[PDB]
Symmetry: C2
Subunit: 256 residues, 2 copies
């Protein structure tokens, strides 16, 4: 099944998490999807000291665990520091390595020592071919015999790569669709349709393009009321918009 990772950018409140979890129930039950509910417990890189951070590790994981129990959802969250991985893996089925930390050896190893699927975001600064080395760090942590990263070995060992765009001058990200093909030599590839759009509405067009190229899954942030969101309101889809997008992805994938 194609992977769908969806949810709000940040944990805002348990009430908010519940509302979005509720509106994702139709997609979560879609037989053609392997679904994971996403929410960050920490936004580590915001513009100001006053910017909303999220609830942090302990309280965030507690809230994600509540969603897992109440909705039966598998969970994705991102980690930022040493010693978060093992604690987060008790709740999270996928642990995500942030794009800025995508080469960070200790974090990749620490996450790979857990039982979680590892989703490695490609840095905006990276050549897709060089992501093989991050995949290999993870794979060697799980099986020291592995010498070279391949899709099949990565799929078996739960290590994925995630496309989220590349720096294109200042304040602009471009999605090099060739990267989806290049990276898929080394690991299953997820396309992040939310964070990849920056320009100095394009989420569906890029996700359709990505589906046509060949991807193993979609990452897209969604919120019931984006204009009242505490992070990424301008770029999140409403649940009905996401359903439409997923419908199109599936139709495209059904051709090939």
């Amino acid at each position: 099944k194609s992977v769908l990772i969806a949810g709000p950018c940040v944990i805002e409140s348990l009430e908010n998490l519940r509302s979005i979890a509720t509106k994702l129930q139709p997609l979560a039950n879609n037989e053609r999807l392997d679904f994971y509910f996403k929410a960050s417990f920490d936004k580590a890189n915001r513009t100001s000291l006053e910017s909303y951070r999220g609830p942090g590790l302990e309280k965030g994981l507690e809230m994600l665990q509540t969603i897992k129990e109440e909705f039966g959802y598998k969970i994705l969250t991102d980690v930022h520091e040493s010693y978060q991985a093992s604690v987060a893996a008790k709740v999270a089925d996928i642990l995500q390595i942030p794009a800025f930390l995508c080469r960070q050896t200790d974090l990749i190893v620490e996450v790979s020592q857990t039982n979680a699927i590892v989703n490695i975001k490609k840095g905006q600064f990276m050549n897709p071919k060089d992501m093989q080395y991050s995949v290999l760090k993870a794979l060697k942590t799980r099986d020291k015999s592995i010498q070279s990263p391949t899709y099949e070995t990565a799929l078996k060992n739960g290590v994925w790569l995630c496309e989220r765009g590349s720096s294109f001058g200042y304040g602009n990200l471009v999605v090099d669709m060739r990267s989806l093909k290049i990276m898929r030599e080394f690991a299953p590839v997820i396309f992040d349709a939310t964070h990849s759009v920056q320009m100095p509405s394009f989420a569906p067009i890029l996700a359709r393009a990505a589906a046509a190229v060949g991807i193993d899954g979609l990452f897209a942030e969604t919120h019931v009321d984006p204009k009242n969101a505490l992070s990424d309101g301008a770029n999140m889809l409403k649940p009905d918009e996401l359903e439409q997008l997923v419908t199109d992805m599936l139709k495209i994938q059904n051709l090939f």
Copy 2:
């Protein structure tokens, strides 16, 4: 005085640190320079699990302290996690925020709570205008009354910005010299002549350009025998090469 930050990329051994420290003694006594000896205790983002990492925090700081004591040098090192800052500041006169972590709030705040000068490396993915927000996080930590970052206030409070190039397609960094002017509105500006050169030596040429534009200091890594170095051998200058470069920088700066 113009700042000079120089030393090996990584701490290789005490013997190596002493050898390069010895060769830097003439530069360190140049009264036109405010000199800091640099060496990383950890290389966090290397290609493979087997790549040389460095001695780690505890042993690294011991070695840097020995250099400070034996040579009288002020010290710069980079920190990678918040919990390292308070102990690192006991030895390092400057704590450097790595380029990939240049927006990381907790790290900037923790480092800024120490008495160290803060050297914030501009990420390869950043618009130089946006570096004001990282400077402001640091400044507000040191003086809550500050509303917007300026060169004067950053200088007073020991917060600097460091140019190290920008992503230019794949496997290429370009130095946008306009950035030196733009960032200097917000803080003193150091130019990193070592890590800014990547192409699919240009260090002296880019350093001369930077000197002509207007900078508060130079960061350049140097090693006695680069071909036998454990990190960044290809990009480090021999001490005599660094001396020539600094001589040229000072001649240019004396014109204006």
